[PDB]
Amino acid sequence: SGVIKPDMKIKLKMEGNVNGYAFVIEGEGEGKPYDGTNTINLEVKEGAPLPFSYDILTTAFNRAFTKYPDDIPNYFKQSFPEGYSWERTMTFEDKGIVKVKSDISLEEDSFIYEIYLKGENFPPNGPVMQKKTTGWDASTERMYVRDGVLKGDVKHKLLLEGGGYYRVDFKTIYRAKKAVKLPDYHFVDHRIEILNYDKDYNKVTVYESAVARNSTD
């Protein structure tokens, strides 16, 4: 049988620092790895109230939760039980930058994430530090092998209060902790949202769906 069950739990901890503000968030959730869906409930443990847009954290809160057709090798699911890690750079159009890394492990029927996030150079009157974003657009991530590991690129966008986009390029490198069958170039279509939040985003629920498809259609 599979180490990845059809219903998997999620536990995570993030240590973060954005424009010098340190914080700690813990999360618990669940998802359906084979359906590509996941929901995480986050709680700020240190650093409340967060003085920046929560949207710069949400995509850090696991591509094991991706629906894949059998004919596209699944880099992420094949990596278990050993698991995988990822590191990501998010370059924002006003020169803000987030670097985030996460280690994804498995114990019984929970994935465990250990996340470190550092955001720098956000303008003090920009949409991030002034909490004027409303969420991410739906996106498509381009997945392809480089130097033996899997890269994912996204030409992404945050939506702004009052209309308009705040563009953000994502570059992620995913590293399996064992030899796996490598996929060809393909796409993962995402939609992430904040489902609910309390006043200062101390308690937040995030949902994401993700589905893979070929690059030859």
Curated annotation (Swiss-Prot):
Modification after translation (UniProt): Contains a chromophore consisting of modified amino acid residues. The chromophore is formed by autocatalytic backbone condensation between Xaa-N and Gly-(N+2), oxidation of Tyr-(N+1) to didehydrotyrosine, and formation of a double bond to the alpha-amino nitrogen of residue Xaa-N. Maturation of the chromophore requires nothing other than molecular oxygen. The precise stereochemistry of the tyrosine has not been determined.
Protein keywords: Chromophore, Luminescence, Photoprotein
Keyword Metal-binding: no
GO biological process: bioluminescence; generation of precursor metabolites and energy
Expression (tissue specificity): Tentacle and oral disk.
Practical applications: Fluorescent proteins have become a useful and ubiquitous tool for making chimeric proteins, where they function as a fluorescent protein tag. Typically they tolerate N- and C-terminal fusion to a broad variety of proteins. They have been expressed in most known cell types and are used as a noninvasive fluorescent marker in living cells and organisms. They enable a wide range of applications where they have functioned as a cell lineage tracer, reporter of gene expression, or as a measure of protein-protein interactions.
Family, as annotated: Belongs to the GFP family.
Role this protein plays: Pigment protein that is green in color.
Name by which UniProt lists this protein: GFP-like fluorescent chromoprotein cFP484
